[PDB]
Amino acid sequence: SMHDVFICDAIRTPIGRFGGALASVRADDLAAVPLKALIERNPGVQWDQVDEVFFGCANQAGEDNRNVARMALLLAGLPESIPGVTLNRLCASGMDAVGTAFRAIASGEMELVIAGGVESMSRAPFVMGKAESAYSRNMKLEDTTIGWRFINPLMKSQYGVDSMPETADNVADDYQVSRADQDAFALRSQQKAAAAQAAGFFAEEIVPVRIAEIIVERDEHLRPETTLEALTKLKPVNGPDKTVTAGNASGVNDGAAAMILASAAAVKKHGLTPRARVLGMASGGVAPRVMGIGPVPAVRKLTERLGIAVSDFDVIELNEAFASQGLAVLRELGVADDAPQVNPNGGAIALGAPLGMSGARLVLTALHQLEKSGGRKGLATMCVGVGQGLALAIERV
Amino acid sequence: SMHDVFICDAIRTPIGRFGGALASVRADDLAAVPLKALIERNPGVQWDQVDEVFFGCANQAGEDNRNVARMALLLAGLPESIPGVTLNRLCASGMDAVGTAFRAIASGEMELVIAGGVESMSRAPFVMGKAESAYSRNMKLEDTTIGWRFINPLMKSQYGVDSMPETADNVADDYQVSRADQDAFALRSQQKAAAAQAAGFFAEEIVPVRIAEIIVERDEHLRPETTLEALTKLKPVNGPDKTVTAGNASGVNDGAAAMILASAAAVKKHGLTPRARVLGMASGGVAPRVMGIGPVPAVRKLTERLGIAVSDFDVIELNEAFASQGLAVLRELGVADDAPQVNPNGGAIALGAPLGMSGARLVLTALHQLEKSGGRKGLATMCVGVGQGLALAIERV
Amino acid sequence: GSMHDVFICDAIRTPIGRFGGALASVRADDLAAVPLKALIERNPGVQWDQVDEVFFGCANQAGEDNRNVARMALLLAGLPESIPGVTLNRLCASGMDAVGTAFRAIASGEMELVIAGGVESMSRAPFVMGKAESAYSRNMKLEDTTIGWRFINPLMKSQYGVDSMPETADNVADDYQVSRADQDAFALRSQQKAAAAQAAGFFAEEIVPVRIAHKKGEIIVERDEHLRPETTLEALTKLKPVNGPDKTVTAGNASGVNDGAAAMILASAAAVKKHGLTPRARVLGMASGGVAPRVMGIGPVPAVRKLTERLGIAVSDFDVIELNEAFASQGLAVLRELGVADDAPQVNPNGGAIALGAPLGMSGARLVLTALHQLEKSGGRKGLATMCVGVGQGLALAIERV
Amino acid sequence: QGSMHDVFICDAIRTPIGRFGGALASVRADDLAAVPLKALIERNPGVQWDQVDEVFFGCANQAGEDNRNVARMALLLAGLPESIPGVTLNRLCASGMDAVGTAFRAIASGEMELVIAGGVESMSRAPFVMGKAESAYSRNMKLEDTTIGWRFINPLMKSQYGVDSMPETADNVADDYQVSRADQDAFALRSQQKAAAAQAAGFFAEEIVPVRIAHKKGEIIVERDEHLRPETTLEALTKLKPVNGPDKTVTAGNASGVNDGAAAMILASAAAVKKHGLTPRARVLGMASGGVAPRVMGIGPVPAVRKLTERLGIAVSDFDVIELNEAFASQGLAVLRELGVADDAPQVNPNGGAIALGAPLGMSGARLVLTALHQLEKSGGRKGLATMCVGVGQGLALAIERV
Ligand SMILES: *SCCNC(=O)CCNC(=O)[C@H](O)C(C)(C)COP(=O)(O)OP(=O)(O)OC[C@H]1O[C@@H](n2cnc3c(N)ncnc32)[C@H](O)[C@@H]1OP(=O)(O)O
Ligand SMILES: *SCCNC(=O)CCNC(=O)[C@H](O)C(C)(C)COP(=O)(O)OP(=O)(O)OC[C@H]1O[C@@H](n2cnc3c(N)ncnc32)[C@H](O)[C@@H]1OP(=O)(O)O
Ligand SMILES: *SCCNC(=O)CCNC(=O)[C@H](O)C(C)(C)COP(=O)(O)OP(=O)(O)OC[C@H]1O[C@@H](n2cnc3c(N)ncnc32)[C@H](O)[C@@H]1OP(=O)(O)O
Ligand SMILES: *SCCNC(=O)CCNC(=O)[C@H](O)C(C)(C)COP(=O)(O)OP(=O)(O)OC[C@H]1O[C@@H](n2cnc3c(N)ncnc32)[C@H](O)[C@@H]1OP(=O)(O)O
Ligand SMILES: [Cl-]
Ligand SMILES: [Cl-]
Ligand SMILES: [Cl-]
Ligand SMILES: [Cl-]
Ligand SMILES: [Cl-]
């Protein structure tokens, strides 16, 4: 029979800007920061009993290569007996790590696990295919920071290779999400994040990154100075007849997060504090060219299976890849554009979105918000490049 | 409460040599080959019901970048509504995809899934770190084909960054596995593989790869003319006092594989043939410098939990990354060096080892051997770079 | 006080290989050294520590030809470390510039005995990557240096354009009204004449072979690889233009990209006597000219006019004209501007770069040495070699057989 | 055969010399080379520019934005007519001096009348290079830095002659010629002191045209050489660590640096001087080159100077200025000692040299010729010698006479 699974302690680094405060920190070292903090914060745990470290990471070409979960656990000082595995569902990878950890415990195969994710987009490398012939004249370098590389002509002909901003424009057009509404959403994100930062809400989630000594402690991507007037003046990324701008989109960023999941038996054995029970995770696919609407089938699949209406959640943490798609998703699910339970502390337009980290951040910040507000059920959901969505539901204990 | 999970149809490409028969085939296209074959071979399936495609891939920097599972299912012609996720546990990735798919169905979250793996080591790209400073003089290209890149000094100082063949020499030394015994094992691998090829055993597992037209239909890596005399003449990789040679080690290779897993209800609805029930998966960690011994703790953990003795398995598919470690593993588990149930059709010394594919191949070939021999329980297990092992048990229906 | 006479003595070249072909395995520096080693073997009366300078032409200099390939080559060839070397770059005219620069050094009395030559390994030309301009730059790019533009300056493009070499040849065909049919007929004559000269052993007299290692033993590369002796007018007419259906330049009426090296000794009269050399021609002079980049193939016209005006020699007075065949369109346009018939018997009598290939840095040295070889075989007196240059130049050099 | 023609250096100008990654690092090498050419146009309105016979430019690298004959790229960018030809010369650090002497030979032999000679290097912007694959799916691809020194090493070169770095050659010169760390540091200090004094006196300002640099709120100008360390003391030099390890003598403080800059000058026959209203400033007497073992390349000037002075029948002691390239204090001192000139002889580098000023490879030799002439003007001296070392074992020397 199935086992209940509890999220326990959870922690994250600050999120850095591209080329900013964390740009010097290798991805594997960055991933190790939250793992080391979990060790320090949870002295009752017998660490050689960790069954697995599951980490999300979208890139894996740079210093996050060759299974960054295992690299990170060894750099964190966890025993060499502890296994690790790295998951890739692009911007959803960190959420997938939590849900995969959940499934491993629920199915009785493990008792005590760490789930998290990482991305260093600053340090994403360039890649060069091998020569396909002697003295080939066709060598090319490609940036892996974000988006398409090594484009397959068959993918392009069948589905297109729209950039992520192009897809967000496509959602704005197809779902009729105005520029004005996008900018209003982006402003609320900045305003709510600024409030939460000043209130110390993010500080409770954050462990500092030491750079050897400089100490990085605050989320750097926020623009509390944002006004509607300033957003209105920005030019769309893809031309004047379009709507997505740098100001109504998330950024490219660096960060890591991690949390402990445990069975009821492991909670007691390790002296953990159970904070939420995981209820379930679901995934859904959509057309690549409207990848931002991906959350809608994921949320519907998960909520229909669990028998929970979207309106039953006390917090919804909806990834803000682009305001156009966040608004489109809310509208498809029948939730108001400014519904109080949605992103109450702001989201990725203010905070940034290091791909592999962001899904683990959404879960842990949803739990944090449930604790602050005394709410019960929380939903975290996010879109995925090339047309998917992922949704995960928790309940505060 | 937990749900039974069945492996149904399974298929793979042939395994190509580095720069050989499949070197022209992009990893995403190669992954799509077994997916398209599963469609052809399973006409009762309603394909928009597939809940997830899980695929193993160790590299993810090349044409396998950005979640090859999803790229591959789209290229295969599967509906865009089907989600996919890519797993990385180095050489164990494909086995992890199977076990992860299993946990998703056992826990009641899914009903019908595809699990598999891919690697194109021929086409693994070079990588180049970003400049850390304007006008940096420290740019560098690294090969991603196999092994360490972007070495972390903290990893080197504490754990070492031994190459995989160095770790195999370390295992040979620490576990006293002689050169003569390694060569005897390598010879049996080539003999058994040559016999299985001739009997049409691999042909039953293989779907051809069509290259624009050349049809690739046979495993390319086999050396059926191998003699003990020829292996004896070979020079060790790591110098004259070492024992691991190119003749007693797996190679660098290209290939892909995939299989269907389903709940009993999905078996019925989609007219599938249930072929084995998945019993469980376990992982284990060891010192990186002796990563070849990693299957030992994985196998022990799995069999202790299931209450199955290693001697109860009718087939053991033990990954042959190196003869030294295959022998060491067998000896620690109390199984003879030439036990008839171990790798009865040969293994990666003869067949090659595209990292992300190999673990999916071991599961499907274990099941295939059970059907041919009338055996009941099968074990597949393998080591993992940087010191892990993975083990998965199945039972023919 | 007076200038000194300057004599070309021995000259030798490698065969010309195709891109990725017979010489593709040979490093550009090693390749440059092959004709130098042959000059040493062929001229045993020379006191080698009296060579004043080695001048070598090389258009690329980013690969194994980097950091002054003249000096690398002379060291690799076994010449004494006391001999200086300098590398010249005027793109496809580099090797001719090395000869004329060597000539000027002796004529002005500053040197007595020199080697001039040129090299290119276009097979082995590397890729180049600019440095990052900022920390964590997302703007890194590789560019091929085999031929043509890289690191384009926006100011060059806006003022002069950055037409590819074949585009410039189509521009010459358009502006100077040179038909596809005439281009193809010229290319056919080049192939026919080169096939005839190869059969006659004419190229063999110029060539030192290059030894290459195979798995089972060694082979010798002895023959120019680029020739297409089977070429016919029908074969040329079927080819598609490089730049699209309304254009005229094809791979069959254009030079190729190729590998090779060449070198020759130049000496004052006193050095000829002292070192036991055989003087073969006197150098008369060299001139350079500029034109619009976008019609760079017409470059030889002002160069030839400048040289012949200064020397007081009519173009029709030359017994051989070696005119580089970068493209049939520009070869024809130059001949027409100069009042020479498209098929005049004294022009390219042994064929040219359409048949033979054109390793940039080597080609100008080959044109001088082959003009001299042709004068000797034919009993001619004066020879003119001239060639075009990317980004709009011409170079011309005149000699007179002794 | 007719008579040789006398050759005159006329106007000459240069950019400031920028540090690596410093004031001129944003400026492409081809645009940088165009800066002194545009200034020569502005400064000499008497000249009929379509009569320039050739632009000769030195450049050691030629793989970056200086590719494909930077002399021709630069003259077109400078606004000179497309009828003017150009050619680029490469003798590494001597390239710019080679341009001047090559221009001299072309006019002396009667082949030209009016020419520009100069040199450029942007070592900041020197690219990386990558050889082509020799085989399909090759696993052996490599990037190499072209900023300075060996790349694409030939095993035959290494076996026979070695592939010592330039600082390693300077250590080899210190060892074999017995040039002490103390003497090297004393030489380096004198270079900084003399350069500081010349800068303050406005001496470099007379040679310099400013370079304009893009900036977000309006372009800025670079007016001054950036490399100078006027506050250097003997104590600071004494404390530096050697480049090549603890027991050696060459340091960053007694070596030239890696730098950016360009320079150019006009050379003309007597007839061209008249026709174009130019001021003849010096006659070029001659140039000579010499080779030495690669491993002690810094001693290259010795055979070059001896060859030149023997032919011209001028003693080293007859020169009123000697501009000796300061690639390394160790080689500078060794050369002087071999030539019988005191380590601190007043006519040697009176305004300092490359240790203080820096050394963009292609530019340096053009700078040495123009600064030698400048110094002869200031001092009233007659004959000047400029000479320098060349990587892989060469030296180049060029002599001029004022008026
Ligand atoms: S799950 C998350 C998945 N990840 C993504 O999809 C990542 C999406 N983000 C991106 O790809 C980029 O961040 C995009 C949206 C393409 C924007 O990048 P660009 O390169 O086009 O633009 P910049 O980042 O250079 O920004 C352009 C200018 O906009 C200004 N700006 C940003 N935000 C604001 C606000 N709030 N107010 C005013 N201005 C704002 C930037 O400062 C920049 O100005 P400059 O003057 O050019 O520096
Ligand atoms: S889960 C699996 C994880 N992956 C690994 O750990 C992969 C380990 N493998 C490797 O990294 C390489 O395969 C190693 C072991 C380093 C060897 O690489 P090579 O590139 O040297 O491999 P080749 O196939 O080219 O073989 C080397 C030479 O040995 C000869 N040889 C091999 N096997 C035999 C047999 N059975 N009989 C005779 N000769 C044999 C090869 O032919 C080759 O000889 P050459 O003359 O060099 O062609
Ligand atoms: S001073 C020298 C300056 N140098 C230059 O400007 C160099 C100019 N040359 C080039 O850049 C290239 O050589 C151009 C003109 C761009 C063409 O390059 P390609 O790589 O296309 O050339 P190939 O010869 O490899 O291929 C062209 C195809 O045409 C066929 N072909 C050529 N010539 C003939 C003749 N005489 N007869 C029949 N066919 C011919 C080639 O065989 C080839 O056909 P494939 O079917 O592709 O083999
Ligand atoms: S014809 C000319 C041919 N060209 C050459 O041979 C060029 C040779 N030069 C080089 O390759 C480099 O310049 C070498 C000699 C290798 C040194 O390179 P660096 O990159 O180390 O140079 P820096 O300018 O960074 O100097 C290193 C440190 O030394 C300190 N330092 C130098 N000079 C002084 C003086 N005069 N006084 C005090 N300190 C000095 C630099 O400040 C620097 O200190 P950091 O704290 O590391 O910046
Ligand atoms: Cl991405
Ligand atoms: Cl992002
Ligand atoms: Cl071109
Ligand atoms: Cl250099
Ligand atoms: Cl200098």
Author numbering:
A (entry chain C), B (entry chain B): 0 to 211, 216 to 400
C (entry chain D): -1 to 400
D (entry chain A): -2 to 400
Task: List passages from the publication reporting this PDB structure.
Degradative or 3-ketoacyl-CoA thiolases are involved in the thiolytic breakdown of β-ketoacyl-CoA to acetyl-CoA and shorter acyl CoA molecule and can accommodate long acyl chain substrates. In this study, a degradative thiolase, β-ketoadipyl-CoA thiolase (PcaF) from the β-ketoadipate pathway is explored. The pcaF gene is located in the gene cluster pcaRKF and encodes the last enzyme of the β-ketoadipate pathway involved in the conversion of β-ketoadipyl-CoA into succinyl-CoA and acetyl-CoA (TCA cycle intermediates). The overall structural assembly of PcaF monomer comprises of an α/β topology β1α1β2α2β3α3β4β5 together forming a characteristic five layered thiolase superfamily arrangement,.
Structural analysis of the A- and AA-mutants complexed with CoA reveals a disulfide bond formation between the C90 active site residue and the thiol group (–SH atom) of the CoA leading to covalent blocking of the active site. This is an uncustomary thiolase reaction that is not previously reported. In PcaF, H356 plays a central role in anchoring of the substrate, mutation of this residue leads to covalent locking of the reaction center. H356A mutation results in alternate conformation of Met 163 and causes the binding of CoA in an unusual orientation, exposing the thiol bond to the active site residue C90 instead of Cα and Cβ of 3-ketoacyl CoA consequently, covalently locking the active site. The H356A mutation also causes changes in the neighboring residues M163’ and R65’ (from another monomer of the dimer in PcaF). In the apo structure, M163 is located 6.72Å (CE-SG distance) away from C90 and 3.75Å (CE-NH2 distance) away from R65, whereas in A-mutant-CoA complex structure, the side chain of M163 moves 3.78Å away from its native conformation which is toward the active site cavity and this allows the R65 residue to undertake in double conformations. Similarly, in isomorphous difference Fourier map from A-mutant-CoA complex dataset, with peak height 5.6 σ–6.2σ were found at Sγ atom of Cys-90 from chain A, B and C and 8.1σ–9.0σ at S1P atom of CoA molecules in all chains, other significant peaks were near the Glu and Asp residues and sulfur atom of the methionine residues.
